[PDB]
Amino acid sequence: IGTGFPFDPHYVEVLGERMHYVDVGPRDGTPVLFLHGNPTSSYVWRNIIPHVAPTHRCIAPDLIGMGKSDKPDLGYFFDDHVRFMDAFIEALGLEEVVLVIHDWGSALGFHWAKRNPERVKGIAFMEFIRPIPTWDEWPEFARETFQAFRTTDVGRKLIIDQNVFIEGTLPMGVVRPLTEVEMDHYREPFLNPVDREPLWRFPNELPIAGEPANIVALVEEYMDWLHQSPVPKLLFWGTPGVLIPPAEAARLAKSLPNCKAVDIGPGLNLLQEDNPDLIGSEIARWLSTL
Ligand SMILES: *CCCCCCOCCOCCNC(=O)c1ccc(C2=C3C=C/C(=N\C)C=C3[Si](C)(C)c3cc(N)ccc32)c(C)c1
Ligand SMILES: [Cl-]
């Protein structure tokens, strides 16, 4: 599994800030937009994109405050990411797109798709954000820590002061051990504690047990849309999984229209790090059917 990131940096000015993005593949045709989550960057797509770039434009931005993008003085609420991602898509002149999305990137992608369905030609997704109505429906192995993350005292001490979301949560979202080189890539945007606000606000935005109500409502809305939409859907899932355990993938396979579910084998949250070969190859095959 490759550890390098051989993509030329590109920057675009968005709402007075610079946003870094990967942009490879042809110039014409429908682009494929890859959206990462927490605490990753476009680095998480590094071994997926090379399967698609031979025949389709691949665009992979770093969310504001993450990766190589600028780090303004913000709270880094989901609403902040929505505003910047909306402007990013406009700044690039994108019309129709195919989405490939993960974790908070899937919240952004599904929310954009719900608001602009005529422009979405397909969605490939994995380990995505859905409403978690109670803590009992959150995976047991992650309950105590995410409950502590969602406080302003201990949660900030863990995530901001001790960088626990990078040194702990990230590696336990991958089945295989991440190498020192790979960890250093993920650590790079957050070496300074003063830059770690996105890592704490994101888990505090997760729609769990009715809080925050605004996020619960928006996620419920895009899940209702997805259940009614004829858009082609490609769902990757693994075992044991984290956000999408095998039982939930099964429920989704049955209920979502026009959906193919693909079992990647062993996987937790960062499925791209455990089976990039299958994920990239399957996306490349699926795009020809859209
Ligand atoms: C959309 C966002 C959702 C992403 C899904 C989450 O992906 C991760 C998968 O779920 C992980 C479940 N993990 C936990 O609940 C958890 C247990 C322990 C710790 C933690 C670790 C973990 C690993 C590690 N290296 C092997 C080191 C630590 Si430390 C820094 C010693 C630690 C200290 C304290 N006080 C608490 C917890 C840990 C974590 C972070 C998560
Ligand atoms: Cl999170």
Residue numbers in the entry: 4 to 293
What did the original publication write about this model?
Here we present a GSH-sensing platform for live-cell imaging, termed targetable ratiometric quantitative GSH (TRaQ-G). We hypothesized that a SiR dye in a spirocyclic form would be non-reactive against GSH, but it could isomerize to its zwitterionic form upon binding to the self-labelling protein HaloTag (HT), switching both its fluorescence and reactivity against GSH from an ‘off’ to an ‘on’ state. This sensor is based on binding of a spirocyclic SiR ligand to HT, which induces isomerization to the GSH-sensitive and fluorescent zwitterionic form. We conducted X-ray diffraction experiments and MD simulations for structural elucidation of the different TRaQ-G adducts to gain mechanistic insight into the varying GSH sensitivities of the molecules.
Our first goal was to demonstrate that a known SiR-based GSH sensor, QG3.013, retained its reactivity towards GSH when bound to HT. We therefore substituted the reference fluorophore of QG3.0 with a chloroalkane linker, a substrate that reacts with HT. Using this molecule, we prepared and purified the HT adduct, Me–TRaQ-G. The reactivity of Me–TRaQ-G against GSH was nearly identical to that of QG3.0, suggesting that one face of the xanthene π-system of Me–TRaQ-G must be exposed to the solvent, thus allowing for GSH nucleophilic attack. This hypothesis was confirmed by X-ray diffraction studies of the adduct, which revealed that the methyl group of the Me–TRaQ-G ligand fits into a shallow hydrophobic pocket created by residues F152, V167 and T172 of HT, exposing the opposite face of the xanthene core to the solvent. Although Me–TRaQ-G is sensitive towards GSH, we envisioned that it would perform poorly in live cells given its constant fluorescence and reactivity towards GSH. This suspicion was confirmed by imaging cells expressing HT in the nucleus, which revealed unacceptable levels of off-target signals.
